[PDB]
Design a protein around this ligand. Sequence first.
Ligand code: 3EA
Ligand code: 3EA
Lengths: 271, 271
Amino acid sequence: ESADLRALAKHLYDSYIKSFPLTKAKARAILTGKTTDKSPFVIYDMNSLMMGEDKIKFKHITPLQEQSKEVAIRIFQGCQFRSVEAVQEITEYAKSIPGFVNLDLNDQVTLLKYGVHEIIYTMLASLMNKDGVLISEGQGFMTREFLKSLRKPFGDFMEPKFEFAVKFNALELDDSDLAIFIAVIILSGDRPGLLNVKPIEDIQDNLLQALELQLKLNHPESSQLFAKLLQKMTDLRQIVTEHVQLLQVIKKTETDMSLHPLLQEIYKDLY
Amino acid sequence: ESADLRALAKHLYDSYIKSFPLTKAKARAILTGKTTDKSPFVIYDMNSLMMGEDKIKFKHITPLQEQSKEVAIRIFQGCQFRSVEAVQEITEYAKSIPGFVNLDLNDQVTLLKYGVHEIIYTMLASLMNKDGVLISEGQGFMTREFLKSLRKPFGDFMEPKFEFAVKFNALELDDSDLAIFIAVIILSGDRPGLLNVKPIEDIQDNLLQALELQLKLNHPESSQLFAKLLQKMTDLRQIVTEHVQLLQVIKKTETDMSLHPLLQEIYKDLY
Ligand SMILES: CCCc1c(OCCCOc2ccc3c(ccn3CC(=O)O)c2)ccc2c(C(F)(F)F)noc12
Ligand SMILES: CCCc1c(OCCCOc2ccc3c(ccn3CC(=O)O)c2)ccc2c(C(F)(F)F)noc12
């Protein structure tokens, strides 16, 4: 039913605004300059990075760890911290998705374990453009060129996400759209080790309907926007697999690395 | 006018029926012996428990967790699992209380965050009699005696809710009464961190009027039920402070640390 599907859309959007501090609308305002409260410090090379990290004078020290390593590894650690925080926000949002908490508790973990990074790259695009990405709660902007030039492996962890973002952002989705798309990703019946597949697919079918209606009602001039959005779901999967492999590379080229206890669990036995 | 207050009550009752599948009328019929045809499985001890635990799995894999830990901890974890489910139902009901979704987003989160526990205990009384509580949407019935027999910490974690349900159920409230009372509790202007108190009080004032007329009409012979009902909140606030306080001890003296990413994160400045 339309009325129902519209209510679900409205619901997902609300918990989305509640679960994710930096939305696309806000990210865009900062990137476009439209907003007015604090222009982002730009990090595009080694000297601006030092000044950006030590910029800590009027801006206190983020909850993330300090440092005592090289640049590449220090960015890797910042990506981990930030990624761990995202996971906490996505889990909170996942709980508001009608049906999700009613699922077998093991499948709730499985859908989270496999859909988390897919969601992190999808939403990370909201903070990107072809020249860089907003960091530190929209406080800074690290250029694509800088991140791409990091010694060997580290650089390849970044560029892929950018090529994805540039194509994903051409779809022009907004928060209300993304709120439903994210939910479609989490309720994926094809995740490895799911015990009760059908109940999860029935919910996804419902969200898929809500998403289609949402796309037709918010972008009436965008032909097949629904299909082209679902296609990007394959791009996401490639990002994660690629990422998982570069993680294997890093185990051979770096010394004591070790990921955060929460990220280690997600990657334990991951495709 | 009465008519508007009565129309609000009916709106609240209808939303309530949609948000909460197992109503008091339904539960009381099961707790008694109406339409004798599906007497729930009664768990009255450890053997019966495990006998019915794998009985709601003997069919298929969809419990809350299975045998592989201390029974007391496993029952405590099932309570958490169900608690997170109830939160989602309460949230959905909240959205139907006139005025709620128009409040500041942050305040909504805050009202729910502190109100849910008071609501969960209030509503659990509908599923209890002096001797036990209906579980798994009325599929099971676990005896208060058994809940009480759980080792020291866990046992006295359950009994206070039974002590509260007996005294509460003596007020003889029905679903149409409870729908309004629930709404009154959610719209409490004294929760910590509320940004706009005035509007929350204005809404609650209209609900207090609705609840009072409802009680005056539905229970004419129950002298001052309205006042006695408001007074029960002091007992609920107390029950919550106890439960929260007892949660401290549990967090400070236990092994199993695998919980639901809701209640935990939810607790903040929570008395
Ligand atoms: C979600 C990370 C987004 C991100 C950036 O996005 C670029 C693409 C990031 O791709 C990732 C995402 C997650 C990552 C890594 C490396 C490890 N992880 C953690 C994980 O795999 O869960 C790389 C770039 C820089 C930062 C920083 C900074 F280092 F500046 F503090 N924090 O977060 C960044
Ligand atoms: C809402 C709990 C209701 C309840 C029961 O009610 C007894 C009183 C429950 O009191 C509570 C209420 C909330 C609770 C706990 C323990 C943790 N929580 C979550 C929380 O409030 O933080 C205990 C008893 C057993 C179960 C089970 C079973 F273990 F059988 F699967 N599921 O749910 C039960």
